[PDB]
Design a binder for these strands. Structure first.
Lengths: 274, 44
RNA sequence: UGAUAUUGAAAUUCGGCUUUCUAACCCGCACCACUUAUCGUGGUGGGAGACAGUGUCAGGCGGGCAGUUUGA
RNA sequence: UCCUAAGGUAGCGAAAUUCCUUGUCGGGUAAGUUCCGACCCGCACGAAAGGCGUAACGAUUUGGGCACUGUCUCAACGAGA
RNA sequence: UGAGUAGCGAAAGACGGGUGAGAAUCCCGUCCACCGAUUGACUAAGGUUUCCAGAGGAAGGCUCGUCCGCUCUGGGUUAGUCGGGUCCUAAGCUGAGGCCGACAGGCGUAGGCGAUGGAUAACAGGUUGAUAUUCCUGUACCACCUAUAAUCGUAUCGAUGGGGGGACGCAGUAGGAUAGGCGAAGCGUGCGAUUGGAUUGCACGUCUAAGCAGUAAGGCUGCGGUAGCUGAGCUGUGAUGGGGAGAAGACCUUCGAGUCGUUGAUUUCACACUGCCGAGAAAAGCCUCUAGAUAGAAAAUAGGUGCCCGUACCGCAAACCGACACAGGUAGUCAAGAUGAGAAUUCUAAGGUGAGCGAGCGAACUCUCGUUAAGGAACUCGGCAAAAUGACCCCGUAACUUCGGGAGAAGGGGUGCUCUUUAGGGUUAACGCCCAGAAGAGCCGCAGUGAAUAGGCCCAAGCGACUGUUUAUCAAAAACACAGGUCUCUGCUAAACCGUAAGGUGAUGUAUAGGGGCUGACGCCUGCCCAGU
RNA sequence: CUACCCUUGGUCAGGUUGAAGUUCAGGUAACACUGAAUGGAGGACCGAACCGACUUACGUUGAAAAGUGAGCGGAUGAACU
């Protein structure tokens, strides 16, 4: 499911693209769209705070349902569509009363039925259930941290978590990065794994294909002047020259840990990523 | 070639106009200096 | 990174680091009213909790930034 | 036989790097301090401030040919400002 | 002083009349010359009376001047419909309370302001020295008022709200029409300069909106969601028993003039249909829904009312920006004939223009162009400059390749004119008009893409893969960027960043994610040391 | 004016090359793999407008405080406005 072009021109030589064979509707929902102007990484003061941002193709924002709020009502998958705002696809479900919403498209899901309720919904891809009703050993995605705020973890293309043994008020979970921590049992989660697993196997091919995505060139700090970067400039090509590589603002950027010294989450983390 | 000054009626009044000098304390101190000196034109 | 003020309980314990409980304090958490706007205020739940945040004092790191010296 | 935390591997090499130096030996010229192919005595090449190769691309640097010509041997005449 | 020296700002002018004190320079006329994807015709920004007429020559105009974008005097801009306000909204800018700050003041909610976009009712002629969709003539339309007649009401008007609609990217080919072109005797001129002509040679061949008809192609089938529908270029009557009209009988006068078949055809009229991945504002007008309000003449009659601002002139230029009457710069629209793929090239049309110093002579020298005997890079740091190659058709073409390329490789042959001919075609009752080929036989010159316009090529090395980017004004490169690779930090009030307060970017994202360092397609590889920092 | 960005508009005569996919007919236990058409992808090709500034000549009390003549590069996009 990965189209590979022919070397007819340079740049397009080793370029690859997706297949989009899983899409069934190339037109969004007119009632669930909103404008989304570009910021270009500039602050409310009008100044640039984040570099390498600007340009890109015009986009519209789709409203997603990260909370899954309803009482045992059964929905049906209407179609799978393309979303330019995230790495994964989205599915349009219709409920038995007429309400239409958007949800992240799990892996290997077709037009069927979905339910969102605790203690009654079954353990099958699509249903959202609290961590209390999830047995140890399941793969979940779109996990929440605060009751009623919305899922925020494992929301990328081909992402998911694994429910380890429960311990009283909290449940142990293993995130994609490899970390292990505890989350309240009252937090919701969805069964399955986010689809579109062949998204990271793409080859952009040329520099122009990344320009209309919203990324600007990145100048190396070693080719700058002394008053512009700690790496400054000498006569010809020069080595680092310092005991440790610096950042554009004068801080070590190799193996220096930037996590804050004291926080509430420290008690809920068992072992960091490895 | 293209010269530095390109006239524009609207942009000239929005940047150096009378109403924009009164919107700021520093701008008001400009009209107080021109009044104290006897200028015939205060703004624009 | 420590001392002290904001800052109160109970027990373990060869003028005390630690399990422990709600009542201060905190919540870009939820539902309501002002109000057919959730910026803000208030009330009820949930989470956390004498920690964090904040003031004063002290020690360390600190060409990121500043003022200067570098003889005949 | 001394010393060191270890004493440069593959590849490449008078090179955008070789001071001695126009190194030496083979090509191209009637005549080549440049150019191409080889020899390692590498002052002072060397593996991601990467090493060695590479089709297609270049108003890039370099050497040799065909065609052409007032660039030249060596100048002459005509038109306009 | 230099010195009566430099210069007088790209270019074709000549003669005959007129005016006047004074004419190479002003006015009129006839020839000639230049532009013509234009130096022509319309319009935004900007300028602000430079616009018209009569009267003037001190100064300004690089000479002159009787003339002027200069001086004096008096004049010139007319809108219910065209462009903006009593309509909407993007970015952004301001915001009652509110949050945060030594003072000032910094953020921000509801709400407002803000086009370069959305909505929205007039067209064709005529007229002045100076205005024209505005004035005038002839025919229309929109909103709002007043009175009087059709259904003999248990109809009507609806939100401040709800749901539809408005509503949107790029590329590609085909098709239906219509503008503007071209050729034929449908009408008016007129037929003779110098040798023979008389199916001779010129010029014309039009007409709005609105309102009624039916109309290529397009999409779509039994209040919102759940389980003979809508839009549509063009055509044709009439409007028009008018208007315009090349010319005619008469040397702002009155008056009966022709409007036809055929060809070729858009870059104009549809994001329509199709495909693709980078996945393509908003709001109001508009049509519905019931809350409620509890009472008419929007298909129709006859009369009334409709405000504010801009409107002159220049606008690739002597009026705009440049100190100048300055080889420079300045958005958009209309786009003729012959040649041709063409908006290229040469000559012309409509319509403009002859440049604000001249007259002589024909030295040196400098600048811009054209030829040159016999040699052909002997020149020079270096083939710098110049020369040569150049379009179309037809044969044919190597080593290397990442199999796409290299390649227009390299090379070679055809090209005008007349005639004699034969089962390609498009459009049509025939006929005719248009487009397009293969043969054979002849003629002329030194030369037939006879002028203008249009790649020199080849054998070997260094660097960077490639398109791209950079020192406005001495460096365009081997420098920067790039796709790819690798290390490292960050579990979400994330790290990082601005303010280092509030509030924000990151991101309406969540490790297939975001920030930072070093390398720089692709192929084969990337060894040893951790004493020091 | 210049550098980057935000919202909303406009512009690029003409010609050439022929990717994926699709279709019919031979293939084949099924695929594979072939052909002839259709099809119109590309920081693709030639070349005006437009945007740039590589070489050279002239001009340097210049027409111009950075221009002019003749050649030159890109020209459906990391394009110009």
């Amino acid at each position: 499911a990965i189209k590979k072009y022919k070397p007819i021109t340079n740049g397009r030589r080793n370029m690859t693209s997706l297949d989009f064979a899983e899409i069934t509707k190339t037109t969004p929902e007119k009632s669930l769209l909103k404008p989304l102007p570009k910021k270009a990484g500039r602050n409310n003061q009008g100044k640039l705070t984040v570099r390498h941002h600007g340009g890109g193709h015009k986009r519209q924002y789709r409203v997603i349902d990260f909370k899954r709020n309803k009482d045992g009502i059964n929905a049906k998958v209407d179609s799978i569509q393309y979303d330019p705002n995230r790495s994964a696809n989205i599915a349009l479900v219709v409920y038995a009363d007429g309400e239409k919403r958007y949800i992240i498209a799990p892996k290997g899901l077709e037009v069927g039925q979905i339910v969102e309720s605790g203690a009654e919904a079954d353990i099958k891809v699509g249903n959202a259930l609290p961590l209390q009703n999830i047995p140890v050993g399941t793969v979940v995605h779109n996990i929440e941290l605060k009751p009623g705020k919305g899922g925020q973890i494992a929301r990328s293309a081909g992402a998911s978590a694994q429910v380890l043994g429960k311990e009283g008020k909290y449940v142990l979970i293993r995130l994609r990065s490899g970390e292990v921590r505890m989350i309240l049992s009252t937090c919701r989660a969805t069964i399955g794994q986010v689809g579109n697993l062949q998204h990271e196997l793409v080859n952009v091919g040329k520099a122009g294909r990344s320009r209309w995505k919203g990324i600007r060139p990145t100048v190396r700090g070693s080719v700058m002047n002394p008053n512009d970067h700690p790496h400054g400039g000498g006569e010809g090509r020069a080595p680092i020259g310092r005991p440790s590589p610096m950042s554009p603002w004068g801080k070590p950027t190799l193996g220096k840990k930037t996590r804050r010294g004291k926080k509430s989450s420290d008690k809920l983390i068992v072992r960091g990523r490895k | 070639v293209k010269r530095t000054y390109q006239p524009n009626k609207r942009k000239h009044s929005k940047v150096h106009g009378f109403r924009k000098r009164m919107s700021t304390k520093n701008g008001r101190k400009v009209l107080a200096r021109r009044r104290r000196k006897g200028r015939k034109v205060l703004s624009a």
